[PDB]
């Protein structure tokens, strides 16, 4: 997270950490708890090649990584069939937990938007995670969860910005309709935030607008971050998460 501060301890109860086996269970990717048995994340964190489920665990909302680990096993991985790379699209995946989570004040689900919500500019949105804090350098060894508030851009204005300083012809769509753009040169997601939730407060209710997907480096000029647009995939999500 570039910009912003340590998150308050109550504020984002749905945030998830994905851990890979090694010399220790290391954080590699974000996610969000959307149902007591289901985590929503990005597809490029887990695919397109198939992963052994022995090597993966889920950690629920810590304040600090590694300090108080309780590692949940994963029963199933479901990657959207259209995915192969994040710039093509469909960068969305589901994890089914082996055991259901006991919902609590400290652990609660986020709400998914109704398909009609478009999230125009001016929507108050935040992104959270344990990624890198500047373009080249790691989150320091206390490892606090960080938050930042980010401005939304319209897709056409965002696609135009990606053509500045590029050879790509203006007729070629870089930013697709399954995508969303947010952030600026001071305020962005970075490496290790991928798969984490973008949430906007609408009529008092927190809704997940997006999943951190890809970009041309952290906080670079004219290169806003690209998010997977959650409304585009609601029908695919509801084939598995029982609503």
């Amino acid at each position: 997270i570039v910009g912003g501060q340590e998150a308050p301890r109550s504020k984002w109860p749905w945030q998830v950490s994905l851990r890979v086996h090694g010399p220790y269970w290391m954080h590699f990717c974000g996610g969000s708890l959307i149902h007591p048995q289901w985590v929503l994340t990005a597809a490029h964190c887990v695919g397109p090649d198939v992963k052994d489920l022995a090597a993966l665990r889920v950690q629920l909302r810590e304040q600090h990584l590694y300090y108080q680990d309780q590692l949940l096993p994963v029963s199933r991985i479901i990657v959207h069939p259209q995915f192969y790379t994040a710039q093509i699209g469909a960068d969305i995946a589901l994890l089914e937990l082996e055991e259901p989570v006991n919902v609590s004040s400290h652990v609660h689900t986020v709400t998914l938007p109704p398909a009609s919500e478009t999230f125009p500019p001016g929507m108050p949105c935040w992104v959270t995670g344990w990624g890198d804090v500047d373009n080249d350098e790691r989150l320091p060894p206390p490892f606090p969860l960080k938050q930042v508030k980010v401005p939304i851009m319209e897709n056409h204005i965002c696609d135009a910005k990606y053509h500045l300083g590029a050879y790509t012809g203006d007729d070629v769509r870089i930013v697709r309709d399954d995508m969303l753009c947010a952030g600026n040169t001071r305020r962005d997601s970075c490496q290790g935030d991928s798969g984490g939730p973008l949430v906007c407060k609408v009529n008092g209710t927190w809704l997940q607008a997006g999943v951190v997907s890809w970009g041309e480096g952290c906080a670079q000029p004219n290169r806003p971050g690209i998010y997977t647009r959650v409304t585009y995939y609601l029908d695919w999500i509801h084939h598995y998460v029982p609503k």
Epitope: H21, W25, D69, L72, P73, S75, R76, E98, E99
Partner: antibody, heavy 121, light 109 residues
Framework: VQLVESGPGCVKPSETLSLTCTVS????????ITWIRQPPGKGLEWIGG???????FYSSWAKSRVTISVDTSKNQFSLKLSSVTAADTAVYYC????????????????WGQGTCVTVSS | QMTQSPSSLSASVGDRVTITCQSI???????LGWYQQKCGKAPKLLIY???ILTSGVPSRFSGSGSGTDFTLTISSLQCEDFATYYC???????????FGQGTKVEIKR
């Protein structure tokens, strides 16, 4: 990386059997342990296990009498079986599931060598 | 719950054999494995997830099964293959999981 059981070998009726499984180097932080029993001349029967989340699961018969627990300060897993009958005479094993599932038998990748326990007067 | 068949077999060195295991429910999501047990030893995992061969196992062994019926096959029995073999399966999460009865294999010489 290997598992070692420990236990009394010989026990008197109505005692409570205590077993411990110890992990020798590194730690099972993200791992499950299950307990397996083999009475003389039978096949394998499952007692129970503990998941990576510290959830516990017990068989159809074991819920009456068995408790399983973990102590990270010792790198130890423990089994207790109350009110033992002679029919509790068996070899007992601890085994690891590498996926961390607390109620699974299809992928027990690492086993101890086992402790035999005889119950007699 | 499961029934494993046959209870015993005996065959030549070099011979081609298979073991079958069947159940009244299908396994939850390929959760079936095969274990080998030898003269006073802990079981060793040979096959997991219906068909994945455990590393270090010689490619004599393979298995697969139609979701409710499962086979383990040995292409050419060695005397080193003298053992009991068990299927194990899992039918949900938390609930029904069990071993089979186990098959005893003697090698004729």
């Amino acid at each position: 990386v290997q598992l070692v059981e420990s236990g009394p070998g010989c026990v008197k009726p109505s005692e409570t059997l205590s077993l411990t499984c110890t992990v020798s180097r590194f730690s099972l932080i993200g791992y499950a342990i299950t307990w397996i029993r083999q009475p003389p001349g039978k096949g394998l029967e499952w007692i129970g296990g503990i998941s990576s989340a510290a959830t516990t699961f017990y068989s159809s018969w074991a819920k009456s009498r068995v408790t399983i627990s973990v102590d990270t300060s010792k790198n130890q897993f423990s089994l207790k079986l109350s009110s033992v009958t002679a029919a509790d005479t068996a070899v007992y094993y601890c085994a690891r599931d590498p996926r961390g599932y607390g109620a699974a038998l299809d992928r027990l990748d690492l086993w101890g060598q086992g402790t035999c326990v005889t119950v007699s007067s | 719950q499961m029934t494993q068949s046959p209870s015993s077999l005996s065959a030549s060195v070099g011979d081609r054999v298979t073991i079958t295991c069947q159940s009244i429910k299908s396994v939850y999501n390929n959760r079936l494995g095969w274990y080998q047990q030898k003269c006073g030893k802990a079981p060793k995992l040979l096959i997991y997830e219906t068909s994945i061969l455990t590393s270090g196992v010689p490619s004599r062994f393979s298995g697969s099964g139609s979701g409710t019926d499962f086979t383990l096959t040995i292409s050419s029995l060695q005397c080193e293959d003298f053992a009991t073999y068990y299927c194990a399966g899992g039918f949900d999460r938390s609930g029904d999981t069990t071993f089979g009865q186990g098959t005893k294999v003697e090698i004729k010489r």
